[PDB]
Design a protein around this ligand. Structure first.
Ligand SMILES: Nc1nc2c(ncn2[C@@H]2O[C@H](COP(=O)(O)OP(=O)(O)OP(=O)(O)O)[C@@H](O)[C@H]2O)c(=O)[nH]1
Ligand SMILES: Nc1nc2c(ncn2[C@@H]2O[C@H](COP(=O)(O)OP(=O)(O)OP(=O)(O)O)[C@@H](O)[C@H]2O)c(=O)[nH]1
Ligand SMILES: Nc1nc2c(ncn2[C@@H]2O[C@H](COP(=O)(O)OP(=O)(O)O)[C@@H](O)[C@H]2O)c(=O)[nH]1
Ligand SMILES: Nc1nc2c(ncn2[C@@H]2O[C@H](COP(=O)(O)OP(=O)(O)O)[C@@H](O)[C@H]2O)c(=O)[nH]1
Ligand SMILES: [Mg+2]
Ligand SMILES: [Mg+2]
Lengths: 44, 118, 429, 430, 440, 426
C-alpha cells in the first residue's frame, strides 16, 4: 500500500480463479452495439 | 427483383452484416438515367410481344438440386500460384468442363487468381 | 394572426398527427382535456397559431383528420390525447382504399373531398390572417397519396397565394411496404411538383438508422419515429410562436430556399439528438449542433448530399446563443467544404434564431437542405416504374376505374425531365 | 362496420367452419350459448335478447353433416336458417351439383345472403370455403361465384380451397371436377389461397409430433390462418391490412390468382421450451419449402409477390431487418418484372390457444401469402390425369346424362391448356 | 460474437461430441438440464458462453451443434441420457439404415439421401451468429458415414459458403491395429476428394492415444471414454482464446495461415504435454519451460509417426494457465538450439504463440490432474510422408487383384474413380518430397 | 492549441494504448470516472493537448481504438479505466485477419477504413490548432500492420503537413510470434518509408532485457512492458504539457533528428529505472541520468549502437535541475567516447528541460537516437523475406487476394535501398 505509479509497482492477486470475458461490443440488426459494462473479468 | 443502395446507409444492409454467411445477391451501386415515355414491351395478359427479342435462357430459374448437381464438384477457391503448369491446367479444365454448375442460381462462384510457375 | 391549418390523411398521417399534437400540447401546457396548466406567460400569448378557443378556457386544435375508413381513427380516439380533437373534424368513408391510387383519386376519394373541403373552408374562414396549410401523408397508400393530392389540388385552386407545406413519407430503398408502391409514388410526385410550395422528404430507413446509431434505442417503435418527425415538424414554425433575435417564418424560409419553381423537395435534420447514457461524454454548444446538423449520416432522406451540391441550406436555432458563434460556424463549414456547395450562389445558408428552447433542453437546431443529390430518389423510382410498366405488371387494377394509359406516360416524362433539371444545375459552371 | 360474411359449402366447408367458429367464440368472450358473460361485429351481430348470432351461411346437399351441428355443443349459437341442407347429395359429380340438384337450392342461399348483407354497414367482402374434389364443393360453389358477381358487383370474393394432393386423393373422378371448376370460376373469382391436405399431413407429422392425425387436427390449423387474415379488422394494430389489400398486391394478372399459404411458428409445447421465436426466425421459415402448405417447391420457379402478416409482440425494425436478409439470398429468386416485392402488416393481439389444441402458446406469429410460378407443375400434373382418362372417354356417361352437353370437356381442356403457357411466359426475360 | 458451429458425424463424431459437451457445460456454469444455477447478478452477468451456447428468452442455453449418424443406435443414448434435455431435439439427425463401411454407399446412395436435411439445419444455426469464426468437423476416415458423407459435407459447404473456414479434426487410421478390413479404400478416396475443399485438417490416431493413457496416466485398459476425454482437452484449448481472457489471442483463422504453406499440404498433427496422473504430480513441478519440451517428445506425440523422420514446416503453441510471457520466450529459444529438432530450410521464423489465463478444467471423476499450466500444439511436419506410403501400400495390395471393388461399383459409382484417386495421391507423395529438399 | 490526436490499432495497439491512458490520467489527476481531483494548477493548465472536454467538468481522451474483431477490446473496456472512453470511438469489424497482411490491407481493412476516417475527421477538425497524430501498432500482426498502414496512407493525403508519429513494434531477432512475419514486416516498412514523419522501433526482447536484468522483476507481464512503452510516450510529449527552462515540442525533435527524409527510425530509452534493493544504494545526481539514457544495453530497440554511428541524439529531462550541469555532460560523453559520433555534425545532441517530474520521482530522463546501427534491423528482415520468398512459401495466402508478384519485388528493393541509404554513413 501507499506506493506511487511507477514502472515496477504492480502485483498479482493470486486468489482469483475465474477469468471469463463478456460480450459488451457486438452487433445487432446491422448496428455495432456497444453496451455498458455490468461485470468485469470473471463475472464479478 | 433488383437490390438497390441506401446511399448513406448501405453498411447496415451489407449481407454479412445481417448474419448471412454465404454467397449473396449483389447490389446496384449506380442508377442509370433515362427520359421520355417507356414503350410497352408486352401486350395484355402478360404475353411478350412477337418481335421483342426474348432471352436465350430458360423460363424457370436454374436451381441445381442434389441429384442434378454434378459429381466431383470443383473447389470454390483455386489460386494457381506455387503450382506446376500441367496441374494448374488440370484445375482450370476441371473448372471449365462444368459450365452448368457455374451458371446456376445457387451456383459456384469460383476464384482463379494468379499465374502458375512455368 | 398567423394561423396554420393542419391536414392529416391516411393512417400514416393520422398517427403522425396524433404524436405531433401531443408534442405541441406538451410545449404549450395544454393538458389531455383542454385546459391550460402552464408555467410562463409566453406559453399563452401566441397559442392561436394552433389552438382555437372555446367557452370555458378550452383549446381545441385547428386540425382536420381525413381517412377512407374509420379503422385508424378508432385508434386515434382511444389514445391519450384523443379527447382534445373536435368530433366534427373527423372525415371518414365506408369502404377502404386498398393501396390503389385510382380508388384514392377518382372513384372513392371524389365523394369525400367535398366534405373535407367544407371542413377546411370552415377552419380557414376563422383565421384572422391565415398563413397556410400543412399536409402530412404517405406516398405508398391509397388514402394518403391519392386523396391527399386531390385535396392539395383543390386547396391550391382556391387559396392560391397561401403556403402549402407537405411532409411526405416517400418510399424507402431497401424494403418496400407495398408491392405496388412506385406507381403511386410516381403519380404523386407528378402532382406534388406542380402543386406544392414546400415538400420535405422522410424515409423510414433513415429514421430507423437515427434511432439505432444515435439515440441507441434497443427496440424503437413508430411511437418514437413519429416523435422524431414531430420534433422536426414543430421546429420550422417556432418563430411564429415565440420571440427571438432573428425571426423567420415559412414564407421567409421558402424565399431564401427555392431558387427555381420546380425545385422544392428538401432533406431535414435535427441537431441536439444524443444517446441514452452518452450524455456525460458530449458538450452542448453551437459547434456541437453544427457538426451534427451537417453530418451526412443524419439526414432523414436516405440520399447522400456528397453525391451532389447544396443549392441552399437553412438552419433554425432555438435557445439563447451568440450571433458571432452562429454566423462564424455557418461561414466556416462553407469555406472548409467547397465541392458540395454550388458557386453561382455565393452564400448558401440562411440562419434564424429563436429564444425558447424545447422543454428539457438548453439549445436545439433544425436543418432543411436543398440539394441536387435528391434526384437519386426519382431515378430509382423511375427505374422501378418502367420495369413494372413496360410489361403491364399490375396495370389492370388501375385501368379498371377509368384511368387512361397516357397518364403513366406523362407522369414518367415529367419526373424524368425534373431529374434532368437537377442534373443541369449540378453540372452548371 | 368492417364485417365479413363467411360462406361454407360442402362437408369440407362445414367441418372447417366448426373449427373456425369455435375459435371466434373463444377469442372474444362468447359462450357456446350466445351470451357474453365491441370488436365482435366483424363476425357477430347482437340481438335484442342479448344473444350474439354469427354472420355465416353453411350449405350442404346432404343432411348427415349439418345434423351434427344441430345436435352438438353449438346448437344454440346458430340461427336455424343459417344451416341449409338438401335431401340428395351431388355424389362426386360436377353435373348433378351444378345443373340438376344444385339449381333447386341456389335460389335459397341467395335469400339468406341478401338478409346478411342488409345488416352490415360497411361490408368488406365474402369468404368461400369449399373443396375441389367433392360434388357440391365444386359444382355448387362454381354456381355461387357466377351468381355472386351480377348480384353484388365489385365486392371482394376471397376463397379458400382444398386443392387436390399430388399422390393421395379420396376419389377416382377428381380430375374431371378439378378442371371443370377451375375453368368456370377463372373469371369470377378474386383471390384463391390454396392448401392441400397432404402437405398439412406432413406438417402435423413433422413439426408437431402427431403421428396419425385426423381432420380435426387439420381444421384447427386452417382456422389459425383465417384468423390472421381478418386479425386487423378486430384488434388494434400498427400497420393495418384490410380484405381489400390482398387482391391488389398478389394478383398481377386476372388469370393468375392462385397464391399459396404458410403459417410459420407451428411447434409443439415440448419444443417452444427449447427455442426462441424471434421475428427473424419465423420470417425465414415462411420461405422454407419444408413448411409450405402445398407440395410444390418454390425453388423451382420464380416468386411474383408476397404478403407478410405479422402478429403479436413485434417491432418495426426486426421486420425490416429480417426481410433484407431474404432479399440477399440466392435461393429466393424473383421474377424479372417485380422489383419491390413485399407487403407487410403488423398486429398486436397474440394468437389464441384453443382448449384441446395442438400448437403451443406463442408470442409472435407470421402468416405469408406468396404467389409463385412454381405452381405450374400443379396444373401440368393434373392436366395429365384429366387427359389420361378422357383420351378414351372414361366416366363421361355420368356427366352427359344429367343436364350437361358433352362439349364442355373439350373447351375446359382447351382453356386451361392456355393457362400452362400463361404461367410460362410471364417469367421469361427481356 | 465469436460463434462456432460444431458438426459431429459418425458414431465416432457423436461419442466425441458427448465428451466435449460435458466439458463445456462444466467449464461454464451450465447444469445438465440447460439452466445455470441462478445468475444472482443484475441482468446478464457473464456472456462468455455465446461461442458455443445460445440462449432463449427464459434462461436456457442450447448448444450450436449438429449430431449426424446413419445408424439409430448411437444417438438414442444421447436422446435418453443425462444430457437429454440440453439438446434441442432436431439437432440430432439419424438415418434408418447405415452406410456399412462403404464410401460409395455413404457418398452416392445413402449420403445424397440425407445431405439436404442437414444443410437446412446448419443454415439455422449459422443465421443466429453475429460473427461466425468457422465450422468444426469431427469424423473418422474408417467408417462409411465418417468418410463418404463427410467428404460430401465439405463439398456442398464450398458451393454454399465459399471461402468460409472449415476446420476438421479426424481419426486417421492406425498403422498396426485397425477396426476393419476395407479402410484403405475408404481412407484414400476421401483424402482425394476433400483435398481442394478443406481448409485445415488435424489428425490423431487411436493407437498413439493408447500409448499415453497406459503409460503417462496410470489407467490400464483405456476404453474410448478415456480417449475422448483427451480429445476434448485439445478442442477446448484451441477455443479458449475465444471465451476466456488472454494475453495473446489466437482465433480459428490464424492456424491455416501459419501451418498450411502450400495448397495440397494441410495436415498438421496434435500434441498435448502435461497429461499426467494424480500420483505423479505430487512430485513434479510443472513450469512453463518444463511442459514446452514435452510437445516435441516423440513419446508424448499423439500420432504414430515420429517427427524426427521429417522436417518441422511450422508450429503452433497454445499455452494455458498461470504462465509468464517471458518464460514462453525462455523455452522457445532453447528448443531451436538442439540438433534433434530440424526446421525446414525455407522457414526461418517457425512459430506461433498463444497465452491464455484460464487454467484447464477438472472433470469430476476424470483422468488427469488438477494442473496449473498446460501446453497444446498443432505442428505440420514432412514426417507425414511416411504415412501415405503405408496407405499406398495397403491400397495397391488389395487393388491389384481387385478385392472388394464389386461392393463399390454396383453401389452407384463407376470404377475409373479408383484408378485415379490413387494416381492423384501419387503426386502428393512426390509433392512432400520436393519441400523436403534444401534450396541449393 | 497544440493538440495531439491519438490512434491505436490492433491487439498490440489496444494493449499499449490502454496503459498509456492510465499513465497520463494519474499524471494529470483524473479518476477512473473521469473527474479531476488534482493538487496543483499545472495539472489542469495545459490538459487540452490530450483530453477533450466533456460536460459537467469531466475529461475524455482523443483515443481512436481500432480493431478488426472486438474480442481484444472487451478486455480493455472491463479494466479499471474502461469508462473514460467515449463509446463511439470504438471501431471494430466482425471477422479478423488471421495474421494476413493483404486481408488486413486490401480485403477486410478496406471495408473498415471509411468508418475510421469519419472518427478522426470529427476530431482533427475539433482542434484549435492540431499539431499531429500518433499510432501504436505492431508490424508482426495482421490489423496492426495491415490496415494500420492504410490509415497512414489515407490521412497523409488529407492532412499532408501535420505530424504523423508511429510507435512501431517491429519483429524480434530470436523468437518470432508469427510464422508469416517477414512477409508482413517487409511489406510494411516499405509503406512507412514514404509515409511517416517519425517512427520509433521497439523489440519485445529489449523490453525483456530490462525487466529481468535491470528492474529485477521475477514475473514481468506485458503490463510491466506496456508500462515502459508508455513512460517514453510521455517523455517525448512533456514540454508541451509542462513548463520548462528550455522547451521542445514534437516538431523541434523532428527538425533536429533527420538529416535526410528517408532516415526516420529511432531507438528510445528511459533512464532512472532501478532494481529492487538498490534504491537505498543509489546516488541521486544529474550525471546518473546521463549514465542510463546512454548505457548501450537499455535501448528499447535490440540494436546496439556499438556497431553504428549516432547520426543525431535527443535528450528530454524532467525535474528542477541546473542548466550548467545538463550541458556539461553533453560535452562529456561526446568528448570521451568519440568513435560513435558522425563527423559532419559537430554537436549531435539536442537538449530540453521540463520542470515537473513524475510523481514520486526527484528526477527523470528520456532519450531518442538516430543510428546507422538500425539498418541492421532492416537487413535481418530482408534475408528472412528472401529466403522465404525464393521458394514461394506462403504466397498463395497473399496472392489469392489478388496481389501482384512484382509488388513483393519493390518492397524488397525499396527496403534494400534504405539499407544501403543508411550505410553511406558508417
Ligand atoms: N381439410 C379438410 N378437408 C376435408 C375435410 N372433409 C373433407 N375434406 C376433403 O373433401 C374431399 C371430398 O369431398 P367433400 O368435400 O368431402 O364432399 P362434398 O363437397 O360434400 O361432395 P359430395 O359429398 O359429393 O356432396 C376430400 O378430398 C378431402 O380432401 C375436412 O374436414 N378438412
Ligand atoms: N479416437 C476415437 N476413435 C473412434 C471412437 N469411436 C470409434 N472410433 C473409430 O471409429 C472407426 C469405425 O467407424 P465408425 O466411425 O465407428 O462408424 P461410422 O462413422 O458410423 O461409419 P459406419 O459404421 O460404416 O456407418 C474406427 O476407425 C475407430 O477407430 C472414439 O471414440 N475415439
Ligand atoms: N413514419 C411512419 N410511417 C408509417 C406509419 N404508419 C404507416 N407508415 C408507413 O406508411 C406506408 C404505407 O402507407 P399507408 O400508411 O398504409 O397509407 P394509407 O393507405 O393512406 O393508410 C409504409 O411505408 C409505412 O412505412 C407511422 O406511424 N409512422
Ligand atoms: N509490447 C507488446 N507487444 C505485443 C503484445 N501483444 C503482441 N505483441 C507483439 O505483436 C505481435 C503480434 O501481433 P498482434 O498485435 O497480436 O496482431 P494484430 O492484432 O493483428 O495487430 C508479435 O510480434 C508480438 O510479440 C503486447 O501486449 N505488448
Ligand atoms: Mg356432400
Ligand atoms: Mg456407422
Amino acid at each position: 500500500h501507499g506506493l506511487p505509479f511507477l514502472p515496477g509497482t504492480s502485483f498479482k492477486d493470486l486468489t482469483k480463479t475465474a477469468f471469463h470475458r463478456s460480450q459488451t461490443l457486438g452487433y445487432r440488426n446491422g448496428y455495432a452495439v456497444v453496451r455498458r459494462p455490468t461485470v468485469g473479468i470473471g463475472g464479478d | 427483383a433488383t437490390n438497390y443502395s441506401a446511399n448513406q446507409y448501405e453498411k447496415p444492409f451489407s449481407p454479412k452484416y445481417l448474419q448471412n454467411w454465404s454467397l449473396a445477391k449483389p447490389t446496384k451501386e449506380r442508377i442509370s438515367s433515362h427520359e421520355g415515355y417507356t414503350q410497352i414491351i408486352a401486350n395484355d395478359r402478360g404475353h411478350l410481344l412477337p418481335s421483342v427479342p426474348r432471352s436465350k435462357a430458360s423460363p424457370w430459374g436454374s436451381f441445381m438440386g442434389t441429384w442434378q448437381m454434378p459429381l466431383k464438384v470443383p473447389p470454390a477457391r483455386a489460386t494457381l500460384t506455387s503450382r506446376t503448369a500441367a496441374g494448374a491446367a488440370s484445375l482450370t479444365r476441371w473448372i471449365q468442363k462444368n459450365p452448368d454448375l457455374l451458371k446456376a442460381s445457387n451456383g459456384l462462384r469460383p476464384e482463379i487468381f494468379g499465374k502458375p510457375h512455368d | 394572426m398567423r394561423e396554420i391549418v393542419h391536414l392529416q390523411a391516411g393512417q400514416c398521417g393520422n398517427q403522425i398527427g396524433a404524436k405531433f399534437w401531443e408534442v405541441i400540447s406538451d410545449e404549450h401546457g395544454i393538458d389531455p382535456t383542454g385546459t391550460y396548466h402552464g408555467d410562463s406567460d409566453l406559453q399563452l400569448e401566441r397559442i392561436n397559431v394552433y389552438y382555437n378557443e372555446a367557452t370555458g378556457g378550452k383549446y381545441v386544435p385547428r386540425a382536420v383528420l381525413v381517412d377512407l375508413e374509420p379503422g385508424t381513427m378508432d385508434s386515434v380516439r382511444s389514445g391519450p390525447f384523443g379527447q382534445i380533437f373536435r368530433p366534427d373534424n373527423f372525415v371518414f368513408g365506408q369502404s377502404g382504399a386498398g393501396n390503389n391510387w385510382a380508388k384514392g383519386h377518382y372513384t372513392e376519394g371524389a365523394e369525400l373531398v367535398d366534405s373535407v373541403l367544407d371542413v377546411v373552408r370552415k377552419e380557414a374562414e376563422s383565421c384572422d390572417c391565415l398563413q397556410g396549410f400543412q399536409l402530412t401523408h404517405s406516398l405508398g397508400g391509397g388514402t394518403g397519396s391519392g386523396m391527399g393530392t386531390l385535396l392539395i389540388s383543390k386547396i391550391r385552386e382556391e387559396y392560391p397565394d397561401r403556403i402549402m407545406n407537405t411532409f411526405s413519407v416517400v418510399p424507402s430503398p431497401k424494403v418496400s411496404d407495398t408491392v405496388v408502391e412506385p406507381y403511386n409514388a410516381t403519380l404523386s410526385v407528378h402532382q406534388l411538383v406542380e402543386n406544392t410550395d414546400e415538400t420535405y422528404c422522410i424515409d423510414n430507413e433513415a429514421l430507423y438508422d437515427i434511432c439505432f446509431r444515435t439515440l441507441k434505442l434497443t427496440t424503437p417503435t413508430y411511437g418514437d419515429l413519429n416523435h422524431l418527425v414531430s420534433a422536426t415538424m414543430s421546429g420550422v414554425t417556432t418563430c411564429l410562436r415565440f420571440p427571438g433575435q432573428l425571426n423567420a417564418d415559412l414564407r421567409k424560409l421558402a424565399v431564401n430556399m427555392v431558387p427555381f419553381p420546380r425545385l422544392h423537395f428538401f432533406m431535414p435534420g435535427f441537431a441536439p439528438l444524443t444517446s441514452r447514457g452518452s450524455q456525460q461524454y458530449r458538450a452542448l454548444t453551437v459547434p456541437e449542433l453544427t457538426q451534427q446538423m451537417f453530418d451526412a449520416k443524419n439526414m432523414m432522406a436516405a440520399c447522400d448530399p456528397r453525391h451532389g451540391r447544396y443549392l441552399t441550406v437553412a438552419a433554425v436555432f432555438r435557445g439563447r446563443m451568440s450571433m458571432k458563434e452562429v454566423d462564424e460556424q455557418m461561414l466556416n463549414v462553407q469555406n472548409k467544404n467547397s465541392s458540395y456547395f454550388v458557386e453561382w450562389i455565393p452564400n448558401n445558408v440562411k440562419t434564424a434564431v429563436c429564444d425558447i428552447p424545447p422543454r428539457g433542453l438548453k439549445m436545439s437546431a433544425t436543418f432543411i437542405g436543398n440539394s441536387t443529390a435528391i434526384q437519386e430518389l426519382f431515378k430509382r423510382i423511375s427505374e422501378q416504374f418502367t420495369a413494372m410498366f413496360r410489361r403491364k405488371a399490375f396495370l389492370h387494377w388501375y385501368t379498371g376505374e377509368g384511368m387512361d394509359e397516357m397518364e403513366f406516360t406523362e407522369a414518367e416524362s415529367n419526373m424524368n425531365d425534373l431529374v434532368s433539371e437537377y442534373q443541369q444545375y449540378q453540372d452548371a459552371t | 362496420m368492417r364485417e365479413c360474411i363467411s360462406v361454407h359449402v360442402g362437408q369440407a366447408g362445414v367441418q372447417i367452419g366448426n373449427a373456425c367458429w369455435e375459435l371466434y367464440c373463444l377469442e372474444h368472450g362468447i359462450q357456446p350459448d350466445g351470451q357474453m358473460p365491441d370488436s365482435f361485429n366483424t363476425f357477430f351481430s347482437e340481438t335484442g335478447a342479448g344473444k350474439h348470432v354469427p354472420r355465416a351461411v353453411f350449405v350442404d346437399l346432404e343432411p348427415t353433416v349439418i345434423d351434427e351441428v344441430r345436435t352438438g355443443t353449438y346448437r344454440q349459437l346458430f340461427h336455424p336458417e343459417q344451416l341449409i341442407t338438401g335431401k340428395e347429395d351431388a355424389a362426386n359429380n360436377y353435373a348433378r351439383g351444378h345443373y340438376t340438384i344444385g339449381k333447386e337450392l341456389i335460389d335459397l342461399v341467395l335469400d339468406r345472403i341478401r338478409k346478411l348483407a342488409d345488416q352490415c354497414t360497411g361490408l368488406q367482402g365474402f369468404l368461400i370455403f369449399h373443396s375441389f374434389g367433392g360434388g357440391t364443393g365444386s359444382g355448387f360453389t362454381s354456381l355461387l361465384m357466377e351468381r355472386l358477381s351480377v348480384d353484388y358487383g365489385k365486392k371482394s370474393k376471397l376463397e379458400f380451397s382444398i386443392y387436390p394432393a399430388p399422390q393421395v386423393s379420396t376419389a377416382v373422378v377428381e380430375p374431371y371436377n378439378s378442371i371443370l371448376t377451375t375453368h368456370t370460376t377463372l373469371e369470377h373469382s378474386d383471390c384463391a389461397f390454396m392448401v392441400d391436405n397432404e402437405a398439412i399431413y406432413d406438417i402435423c407429422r413433422r413439426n408437431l409430433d402427431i403421428e396419425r392425425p385426423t381432420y380435426t387436427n387439420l381444421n384447427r390449423l386452417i382456422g389459425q390462418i383465417v384468423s390472421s387474415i381478418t386479425a386487423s379488422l378486430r384488434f388494434d394494430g400498427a400497420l393495418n391490412v384490410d380484405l381489400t389489400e390482398f387482391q391488389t398486391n398478389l394478383v398481377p394478372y386476372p388469370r393468375i390468382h392462385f397464391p399459396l399459404a404458410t403459417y410459420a411458428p407451428v411447434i409443439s409445447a415440448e419444443k417452444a421450451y427449447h427455442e426462441q421465436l424471434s421475428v427473424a426466425e419465423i420470417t425465414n421459415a415462411c420461405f422454407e419449402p419444408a413448411n409450405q402448405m402445398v407440395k410444390c417447391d418454390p425453388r423451382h420457379g420464380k416468386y411474383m409477390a408476397c404478403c407478410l402478416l405479422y402478429r403479436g409482440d413485434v417491432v418495426p425494425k426486426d421486420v425490416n431487418a429480417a426481410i433484407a436478409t431474404i432479399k440477399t439470398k440466392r435461393t429466393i429468386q424473383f421474377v424479372d418484372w417485380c422489383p419491390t416485392g413485399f407487403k407487410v402488416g403488423i398486429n398486436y393481439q397474440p394468437p389464441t390457444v384453443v382448449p384441446g389444441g395442438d400448437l403451443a402458446k406463442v408470442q409472435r406469429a407470421v402468416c405469408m401469402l406468396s404467389n409463385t410460378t412454381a405452381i405450374a407443375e400443379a396444373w401440368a400434373r393434373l392436366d395429365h390425369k384429366f387427359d389420361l382418362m378422357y383420351a378414351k372417354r372414361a366416366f363421361v356417361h355420368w356427366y352427359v346424362g344429367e343436364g350437361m352437353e358433352e362439349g364442355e370437356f373439350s373447351e375446359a381442356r382447351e382453356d386451361m391448356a392456355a393457362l400452362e403457357k400463361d404461367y410460362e411466359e410471364v417469367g421469361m426475360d427481356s
